[PDB]
């Protein structure tokens, strides 16, 4: 279901901007999880270009130049 599916994501900021932050931050902390940003709300949190709209060319460029 949609709230169990958005809280079970491979990106803990996406699952922490949404409902309960305690459960998700302890699960991510004891798992040692890492957030390869790669979505819209991680980049709205961290303050950069959205990887969808005009910023999709910027993220193509950055993903190409690694």
């Amino acid at each position: 279901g949609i709230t169990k599916a958005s809280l079970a994501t491979e990106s803990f900021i996406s699952a922490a901007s949404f409902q309960e932050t305690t459960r998700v931050l302890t699960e991510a902390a004891v798992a040692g999880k890492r957030d390869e940003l790669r979505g819209l709300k991680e980049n709205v949190i961290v303050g950069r270009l959205i990887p969808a709209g005009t910023g999709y060319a910027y993220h193509q460029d950055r993903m190409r130049r690694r």
Partner: protein
């Protein structure tokens, strides 16, 4: 309430009629002012499950996609195929309903001109590409989404479709509310699906399958009606037959589950002993 409000607003409502009116309107204001919270929380859950999904390819390179048919509840055909397969790219190439013709090719967007050439040929159902069958890792390819919907063309490489989709489902959350036998209507041809049947002694084709779908196909090829016929019903008609508009074609009794047979012969009571297994209840008002 069994006593209505016989006075309109140009005539005056008296006191009791206005008080019953206030019952009916206070319920509506409470429903909107509490409905809006669930509508907003639904939009939030939807844009946070979507949140990631970006059109990131141009073709996933597949041949799978869902089978768009017109939807029919049992009344007249509710939503036509041109509402469901408008601007969605076909999965395999649609055969023209005559015989084995390449009417449309296998990766064409179906805009209004293609949908009119679909409606002229009375095309049954289209196997079309759906987003849930997209093979793209981490995103949706540009063909399996479909038309842009506010642009005439296909979706561009990039445009966030998860967020516009989540907003478009959750945005009408305010307008939504919060709190015998089969009689045919039109005149056409009969077809049966999921059917295993047998002819009774009288002639009415009874069915030995519970899950039988009774379709009414017209003289053109498209499916215009559909119904669900239970296990053991008295069908007035048969397979492939032509009927008249309004003629009863089905009959059953839902309060009496039929234990009808396939063959004939004599009846024996196997493991039926009166006193422990079955009981003797002679009827009061009839005697049988």
């Amino acid at each position: 309430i069994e006593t209505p409000i016989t006075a309109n607003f140009r005539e005056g409502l008296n006191v009791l009629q206005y008080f019953i009116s206030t019952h009916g309107a206070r319920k509506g204001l409470a429903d909107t002012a509490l409905k809006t919270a669930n509508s907003g929380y639904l939009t939030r859950r939807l844009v946070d499950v979507a949140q990631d999904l970006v059109v990131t390819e141009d073709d996933c390179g597949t041949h799978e996609g869902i089978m768009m048919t017109p939807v029919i509840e049992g009344g007249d055909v509710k939503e036509p195929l041109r509402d469901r397969v408008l601007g969605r790219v076909t999965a395999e190439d649609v055969l023209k309903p005559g015989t084995a013709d390449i009417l449309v090719p296998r990766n064409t967007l179906l805009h209004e001109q293609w949908c009119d050439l679909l409606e002229e040929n009375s095309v049954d159902a289209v196997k079309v590409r759906s987003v849930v069958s997209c093979d793209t890792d981490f995103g949706v390819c540009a063909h399996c989404y479909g038309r842009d919907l506010a642009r005439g063309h296909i979706i561009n490489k990039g445009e966030a479709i998860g967020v516009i989709a989540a907003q478009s489902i959750g945005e009408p959350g305010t307008q939504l509310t919060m709190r015998s036998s089969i009689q045919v209507k039109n005149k056409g041809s009969i077809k049966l699906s999921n059917v295993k049947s047998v002819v009774n002694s009288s002639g009415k084709l009874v069915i030995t399958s519970r899950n039988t779908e009774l379709k009414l196909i017209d003289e053109f090829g498209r499916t215009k009606e559909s119904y669900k016929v239970p296990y053991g019903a008295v069908l007035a008609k048969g397979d492939g037959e032509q009927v008249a508009g309004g003629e009863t074609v089905a009959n059953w009794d839902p309060h009496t589950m039929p234990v009808i047979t396939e063959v004939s012969g004599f009846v024996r009571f196997t493991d039926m002993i009166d006193g422990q297994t079955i009981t003797r209840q002679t009827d009061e008002l009839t005697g049988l």
